Amino acid sequence: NQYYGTGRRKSSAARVFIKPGNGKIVINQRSLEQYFGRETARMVVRQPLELVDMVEKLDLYITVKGGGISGQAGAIRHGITRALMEYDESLRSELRKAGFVTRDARQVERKKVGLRKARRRPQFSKR
Amino acid sequence: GQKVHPNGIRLGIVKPWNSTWFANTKEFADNLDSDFKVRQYLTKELAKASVSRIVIERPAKSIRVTIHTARPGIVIGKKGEDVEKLRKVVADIAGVPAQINIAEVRKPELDAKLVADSITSQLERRVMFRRAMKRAVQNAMRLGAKGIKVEVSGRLGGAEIARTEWYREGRVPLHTLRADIDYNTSEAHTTYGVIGVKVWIFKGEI
Amino acid sequence: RIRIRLKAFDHRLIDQATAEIVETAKRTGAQVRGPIPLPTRKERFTVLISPHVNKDARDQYEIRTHLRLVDIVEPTEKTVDALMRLDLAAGVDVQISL
Amino acid sequence: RSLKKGPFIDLHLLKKVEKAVESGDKKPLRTWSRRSTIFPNMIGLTIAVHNGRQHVPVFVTDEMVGHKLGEFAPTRTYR
Amino acid sequence: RWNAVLKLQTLPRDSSPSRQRNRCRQTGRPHGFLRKFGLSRIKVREAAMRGEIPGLKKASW
Amino acid sequence: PRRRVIGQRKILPDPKFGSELLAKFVNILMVDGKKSTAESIVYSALETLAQRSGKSELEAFEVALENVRPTVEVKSRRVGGSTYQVPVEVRPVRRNALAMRWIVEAARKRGDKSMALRLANELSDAAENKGTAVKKREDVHRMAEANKAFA
RNA sequence: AAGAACCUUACCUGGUCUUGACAUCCACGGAAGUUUUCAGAGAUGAGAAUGUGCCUUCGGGAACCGUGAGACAGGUGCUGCAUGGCUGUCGUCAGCUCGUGUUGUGAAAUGUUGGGUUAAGUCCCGCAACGAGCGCAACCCUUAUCCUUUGUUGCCAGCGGUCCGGCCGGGAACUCAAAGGAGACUGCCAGUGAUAAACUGGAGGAAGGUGGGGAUGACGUCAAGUCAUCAUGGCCCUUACGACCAGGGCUACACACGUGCUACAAUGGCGCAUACAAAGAGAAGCGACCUCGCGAGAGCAAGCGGACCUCAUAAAGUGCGUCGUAGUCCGGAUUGGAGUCUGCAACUCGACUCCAUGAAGUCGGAAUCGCUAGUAAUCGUGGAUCAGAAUGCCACGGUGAAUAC
């Protein structure tokens, strides 16, 4: 039956589902490849279907919103590694070595008063 | 000064706002207008009573003003009479039904605005400040304050140069975020001009 | 159906009013949805501190606007009035539409 | 040119203008307003338009339909 | 445009939204005014830190 | 820095092509956060390099880079008299860094077309070992040992 | 100064008033007020109309107006080196000090020197000092992860029903939201280290050695800045340095400099197609949709005081095609003509559209600034201010590095 995995990166919500089968990649009820998957997260999200196994053993259903390209990818990435568990999650132990059991925490740093950006400081006359 | 105000930082933490009525954007300015107006009259009448803190709060779409205090006696007088006499002219200022409850706090020398007016009144007497202020501070520790501190600012003694002079007695742990800090500025007006009176009183840690 | 959308400075306060509408409703009749949470409005200000000059440092301020939504799907019309009115709604603003 | 579907003119000055139109030209009129946009009826008539310290003598001519009173007046002195 | 109606500018010109400034309600300052309290920034700060303004607090987002 | 150590993340290997070295090269080449126009440039340059040279894919830019990797770099230093230029033996990582580093500035400086072509041309006259990258490499060997023993 | 067309605005040239623009206070007469006029640039003076009201005690009185009287009002006038209040700054730098004790004739010293250790007066051991208090630390907010409570205006897997559009039952699983909570404490182990403190490395773990950010600013320094936010000692003018009003000025221009924006292009211009956001704001508001206009925009006009509706159709990016090294299909200054928008008003002195014109610039001297990771860099969006006002400031996210021996 179904194997679920959620995940987030940069405020992008994803929802991954997994069952056995010769899966194509389904994202928001269209293919990721018909979402330009030659470019869009191109091998990036199929990371658990790289290191520990091949692609064509699991059917997959994904629904994602938010971010841009790299914004969209990491929520699906961390949901899909967690959803990789057809017979148990033993492969998380090998993916722990790779690091893809841990999503990248990082977010944009706010603007603050007196800075041009977030660490960028203005220039000032003499010294 | 360069420190943040103790009262303001602790508002979401441990110090209730001194008005607590809710309002929408349309009437928020107008409720704050009557709120800032009442406090002028309220400070003016109750000089002997001496305000601790005030809650201006929402009853049935009108106004209500719970005033805490050192001395209820001048406020109360006979029955509900001299409270009602104030509440009547507040109802005229607010333009709606106004409701007043005066609330005594025992050991009033222990609370900060209340002691500050006592110190500032002896400045109006024109006392020798160096002993007088410290004798006032010692009273709080004697009456079981955990910590207390005072600072004065100005042409003290009528001085040609401006000067400052703190004192502190007990544990007042200012950058500690859990700490309950009661703090108030007040000022005196003299023939040499205005003298600031700052007083910090520390109660507890949770 | 009949619904109450509330508004509050304190999250733990609008919490007590939406507690009171529940236990009032299942007491007097039935059929209340409790507090639907709904996203928070945050009025973020920044203003200049100094009386004069000194642009560089400013102080930021916030007013958290907590909303709640309670609906009653209640058809018991003659106990709806008993649910109505009597509440003081934890000293913070409430509006009750059909 | 600009300023949409038709310009503005000054009411108190317009009654003086009807004297200037009917009776014909006489002298520069001393007017505080600069605001009026000129149209044919002001043509051929001496007026004077303020620059913030004196009324500037404009005699009006043919193409001044394109202009306000104010335009000929210098408000800033130069070397 | 139309007839006598555009010529009705005998108004005080105190009608216009071009006219009223929105000075600080307490102090008359005509700069630093945010509309939400209707005060210039310094009396906003003086009030807010002294805990009078309801529901207002510091920000650390 | 003086005190606490720095050792950053080891970046993504390039998709399909499989070169994490060329992934680092595009990250050095990258103009103004456009990793997209960078990856667009690199494959067009790599095909035009391998097409021109007649060689295979991975070793084409690698052999071009290999000639232009010196074993030393120089540092400005002083202890006694007015400033000295002091040669020092490069880190093997920083060696491959410096070869790639001079390439992007060299590719900007060429008389050539658009960026895929001009970069492939720069790799072409480093594979042939006669252009600007070998000229930038063939400097430090002359300069060393006139100045050997300072730190 | 988070908004100089008038107003703002203080100043000038002009027009005016002097118990006044505003308070407190008396008398006397008049409802307040809604209409209209002539003369004036207007302020205004000078009019005719009309209205002639709630309490009353029949002298009235309160709401309120006009006239006159004298006590007075007024000042962004002066004095920050008379001041409060308030703020910058060195600097969130790790220091700084008092009780007693000892030591010295005494100023004072020690504590707070040592030996190690850290982000750190962080901690151990050692010590003629033991203790205390301010400080960093930590309590907080927000963010990285999980679990519980809750399921509309939000969300949609498994289910049916579908104009097969989350649309309509329904499921509330699951997302999100917001209420409440958990977890990470050097703790787990090993080694090293004066065995102690501590440190290095690894473990396990979503998060490991102050987790990241933000909030949070010691004692004190510059007789710092601020009498124009306000308050205020003292001084001065008080038929003028006050008050009211019109236009003008604050936007000038042989110049110099600061701080920003936009360029000098081919990683790019230009044309078509194609596509993911995040945070906001909104009732004298925002204003779909629909129609009309060359477009700017215009007319008619739903929905919503907002997870709903509106501004609002996020751009860089990506797919194809053109241009090919040129002052260019680069670039936009300047200037012309013809238009739209706001407002009593675009005249000195607004923004914006359309057509036309197409300077300089082909990457900037000596010198100098910023930044160590979601940062630098780069492209969009939003707000406050607001009639109309942005390349500023303030806020949010997209793409996203290099190098630190």
- C–E: how many Cβ contacts below 8 A? 39
Do B102 and B119 belong to one domain? no
Closest nucleotide to E24, Cα to C1': G229
How do strand B98-104 and strand B63-69 relate by DSSP bridges? parallel
Q: Distance between CA D26 and CA D42 in Å, rounded? A: 13
Cβ(D49)–Cβ(D31) below 8 Å? yes
Cα-Cα end-to-end distance for chain B: 26
Closest nucleotide to D71, Cα to C1': G347
Expressed as residue numbers, the domain containing B53 is: 16-106
Q: Distance between CA F30 and CA A78 in Å, rounded? A: 27
Cβ(B105)–Cβ(B72) below 8 Å? no
Q: How far is CA E12 from CA D15, D32, E8, in A?
A: 20, 17, 11
Closest nucleotide to F28, Cα to C1': G402
Question: Which residues, listed in sequence order, are joined to residue A3 by a DSSP beta bridge?
Answer: A18
Do B140 and B80 belong to one domain? no
- Dihedral sign for Cα atoms in the order E14, E17, E18, E23: positive
- B30: CB partners within 8 A, 6+ apart: none
Do B163 and B195 belong to one domain? yes
Tell me whether residue B139 is in a domain.
yes
- E17: CB partners within 8 A, 6+ apart: none
Q: Is C88 (CB) below 7 Å from strand G?
A: no
DSSP string, D46-71: EEEEE-SSSEEEEE--GGGGG-BSGG
Chains C vs F: touching, with 3+ CB pairs under 8 Å?
A: no
The SS3 assignment for C64 reads: strand
Cβ(A77)–Cβ(A46) below 8 Å? no
CB atoms within 10 A of CB B76: 15
Of E10, B37, B152, B14, the residue nearest D12 (C-alpha): E10
Do B128 and B181 belong to one domain? yes
Q: Tokens for C76?
A: 């018991």
Among C residues 16-75, those touching chain E with beta carbons less than 8 Å apart: 42-45, 47-49, 51, 59-64
Closest nucleotide to E42, Cα to C1': G229
The SS3 assignment for B28 reads: helix
Closest nucleotide to F107, Cα to C1': G267
Do B123 and B68 belong to one domain? no
Q: How far is the CA of D54 from the C1' of G198 (A)?
A: 88
CB atoms within 10 A of CB B198: 19
Chain E residues 12-51, Cβ below 7 A from strand G: 12-13, 15-19, 21-22, 24, 27-36, 40-43
Give me the helices (H) in B23-69, please: 25-45
Q: How far is the CA of E30 from the C1' of G242 (A)?
A: 21
Q: Tokens for C67?
A: 């909303």
Tell me whether residue B4 is in a domain.
no
B195 exposure class (CB count in 10 Å sphere: 0-12, 13-18, 19+): buried
Give the residue with minimal CA–C1' separation from G119: F4
Tell me whether residue B3 is in a domain.
no
In this structure, what are the phi and psi dihedrals at residue C94, rounded to the nearest 5 degrees? -135, 140
Q: Least CB-CB distance to B8: which of E26, E36, E49?
A: E49
- C69: CB partners within 8 A, 6+ apart: C3, C4, C5, C6, C35, C36, C38
Tell me whether residue B140 is in a domain.
yes
Do B169 and B97 belong to one domain? no
DSSP string, C11-62: HHHHHHHHHHHHHHHHHHS--B---B--PPEEEEEEEE--SSS-TT-EEEEE
The SS3 assignment for C96 reads: strand
CB atoms within 10 A of CB B154: 20
Question: Which residues, listed in sequence order, are joined to residue A31 by a DSSP beta bridge?
Answer: A26
Q: Give the residue from B79, B106, B133 where a domain finishes.
A: B106
- B184: CB partners within 8 A, 6+ apart: B112, B113, B116, B198, B199
Q: How far is the CA of B176 from the C1' of G23 (A)?
A: 48
Q: Tokens for A10?
A: 């940069």
- B60: CB partners within 8 A, 6+ apart: B97
For residue C93, the chain B residues in CB contact (below 8 A) are 22-24, 58
Q: How far is CA F52 from CA B54, F106, F139, in A?
A: 86, 19, 28
Q: Distance between CA E11 and CA C95 in Å, rounded? A: 43
Q: Is A88 (CB) below 7 Å from strand G?
A: no
Q: How far is CA F1 from CA B116, F4, F10, in A?
A: 53, 7, 20
Q: Give the residue from B45, B76, B106 where a domain finishes.
A: B106
Q: Tokens for F115?
A: 């960026």
How do strand A12-20 and strand A8-9 relate by DSSP bridges? antiparallel
Total domains present in chain B: 2
CATH code at position B174: 3.30.1140.32
Q: Distance between CA C54 and CA C57 in Å, rounded? A: 7
Of B131, B143, B152, B196, the residue nearest B170 (C-alpha): B143
- Dihedral sign for Cα atoms in the order F108, F110, F114, F115: negative
- The three-point CA angle B144-B149-B153 to 5° equals 145
Amino acid identity at B31: N
- A114: CB partners within 8 A, 6+ apart: A121, A122, C56, C57
Q: Length of chain B, please?
A: 206
| Dihedral over alpha carbons F143, F145, F146, F149 (to 10 degrees) | 130
Q: How far is CA F146 from CA B21, B73, F149, in A?
A: 83, 97, 9
Amino acid identity at C38: L
| Beta strand ranges found along chain B (DSSP E) | 51-57, 63-69, 98-104, 147-154, 163-170, 181-190, 193-202
Q: How was this structure determined?
A: cryo-EM
Q: How far is CA C24 from CA C27, C31, C86, in A?
A: 5, 11, 10
The SS3 assignment for D24 reads: coil
Tell me whether residue B50 is in a domain.
yes
Q: Distance between CA E31 and CA E24 in Å, rounded? A: 8
Q: Distance between CA D35 and CA D74 in Å, rounded? A: 15
Cβ(B202)–Cβ(B175) below 8 Å? no
Chain B residues 98-157, Cβ below 7 A from strand G: 147, 153-155
DSSP B162: -
Domain residue spans of chain C = 1-98
Q: Distance between CA B155 and CA D66 in Å, rounded? A: 69
What is the fold, at CATH topology level, of the domain defined by C1-98? Alpha-Beta Plaits (3.30.70)
Q: Give the residue from B53, B74, B106 where a domain finishes.
A: B106
DSSP string, A74-114: HHHHHHHHHT--TT-STTHHHHHHHTTTS-----PPPP-TT
Do B130 and B100 belong to one domain? no
Q: Chain F: which residues have CB within 8 Å of chain A? A: 15-16, 36
Of B27, B8, B30, the residue nearest B17 (C-alpha): B8
A82 exposure class (CB count in 10 Å sphere: 0-12, 13-18, 19+): buried
CA contacts within 13 A on the Cβ side of B72: 15
CATH code at position B36: 3.30.300.20
- C29: CB partners within 8 A, 6+ apart: C74, C76, C79, C80, C82, C83
CB atoms within 10 A of CB B178: 11
Cα-Cα end-to-end distance for chain F: 18
- E29: CB partners within 8 A, 6+ apart: E23, E40, E42
The helix (run of H) or strand (run of E) holding residue F121 is helix F115-127
Q: Is D20 (CB) below 7 Å from strand G?
A: no
Do B39 and B77 belong to one domain? yes
| Dihedral over alpha carbons B110, B113, B116, B120 (to 10 degrees) | -150
Q: How far is the CA of F3 from the C1' of G118 (A)?
A: 12
For residue B16, the chain E residues in CB contact (below 8 A) are 51
How do strand A58-65 and strand A25-27 relate by DSSP bridges? parallel
Do B102 and B121 belong to one domain? no
Q: Length of chain E, please?
A: 61
F103 exposure class (CB count in 10 Å sphere: 0-12, 13-18, 19+): buried
Residue from E2, E3, E5, E7 whose CB has the most chain D CBs within 10 Å, to mutate: E7
The helix (run of H) or strand (run of E) holding residue D17 is helix D11-22
Any chains having at least 3 CB pairs less than 8 A from chain E are B, C, D
CB atoms within 10 A of CB A14: 26
Do B142 and B204 belong to one domain? yes
Do B73 and B120 belong to one domain? no
Do B165 and B182 belong to one domain? yes
Of F29, F47, F48, F50, the residue nearest F38 (C-alpha): F29
The SS3 assignment for A63 reads: strand
- A124: CB partners within 8 A, 6+ apart: none
Cβ(A80)–Cβ(A5) below 8 Å? yes
- Dihedral sign for Cα atoms in the order E38, E43, E49, E52: negative
